[PDB]
């Protein structure tokens, strides 16, 4: 059985300006197995509500998902995205960067 | 729309 590893990315819909509400996006595109546990994080604690895009595979037969959640950036906050997957031995946490 | 009748692989 073929399997692939996620390619995880974290960013914002709008450029990061403090005090302006933006949508944190965790976009993943590896996903050969559909089963997945991806959770956004703020200061090490998961955001209460997430909204997941529908599974749409590309021509490589690899899915991609987009978790977009409203938030307000702050000078001292490090948002992140955790991904637990079948291929991953341990959950992979990627940290938000204002200039990725 | 969609394909009307889809056969069984």
């Amino acid at each position: 059985m073929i399997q692939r590893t996620p390619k995880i990315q974290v960013y914002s819909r709008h450029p990061a300006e403090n005090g302006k509400s933006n949508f944190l996006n965790c976009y993943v595109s590896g996903f050969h197995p559909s089963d997945i546990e991806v959770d956004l994080l703020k200061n090490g604690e998961r955001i209460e509500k997430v909204e997941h895009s529908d599974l749409s595979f590309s021509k490589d037969w690899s899915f991609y998902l987009l978790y977009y959640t409203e938030f307000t950036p702050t000078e001292k906050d490090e948002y992140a995205c955790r991904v637990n997957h079948v291929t991953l031995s341990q959950p992979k946490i990627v940290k938000w960067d204002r200039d990725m | 729309s969609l394909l009307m009748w889809i056969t069984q692989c």
């Binding site: - | 729309s1 009307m4 009748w5 889809i6 056969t7 069984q8």
Partner: protein
């Protein structure tokens, strides 16, 4: 669908399609649609009320499905001048009927029991969509 009539709503949906189609264009298009509907309904009744089948019966079901496909294709020819996508849907329905008959021959009866329901389901959905489309063309006039 396992009972005597697998899907008798095709006849009612095609009657609705005919009534919403009689207001525009000539009535022989509705005649072809309704004749194809009655052939499909007869084929579905014959295959559905099966003893579980006679190859000659298979041939007869193929004849009804192919004749309904011919009716659908003639209707597609005489409707495609107005609402071209409705004509394309009619052509797809005719080709689906031909392919369904070709399946009916080359399939075990137990394997075709579900596929008859699937074909009736798809054709009924397409008929409802076509009814809505010709209805909005009637409204636009």
């Amino acid at each position: 669908e396992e009972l005597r009539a697998a899907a008798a709503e095709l006849l009612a949906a095609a009657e609705a399609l005919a009534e919403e189609l009689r207001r525009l264009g000539l009535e022989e298009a509705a005649a072809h649609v309704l004749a194809a509907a009655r052939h499909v309904a007869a084929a579905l009744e014959l295959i559905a009320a099966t003893p579980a089948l006679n190859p000659e019966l298979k041939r007869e079901v193929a004849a009804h499905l192919r004749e309904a496909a011919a009716h659908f294709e003639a209707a597609a020819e005489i409707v495609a001048a107005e609402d071209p996508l409705a004509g394309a849907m009619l052509r797809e329905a005719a080709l689906a009927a031909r392919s369904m008959a070709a399946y009916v021959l080359h399939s075990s009866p137990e394997e075709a029991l579900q596929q008859a329901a699937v074909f009736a389901t798809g054709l009924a959905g397409a008929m409802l969509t076509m009814t809505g489309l010709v209805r909005e063309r009637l409204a636009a006039r």
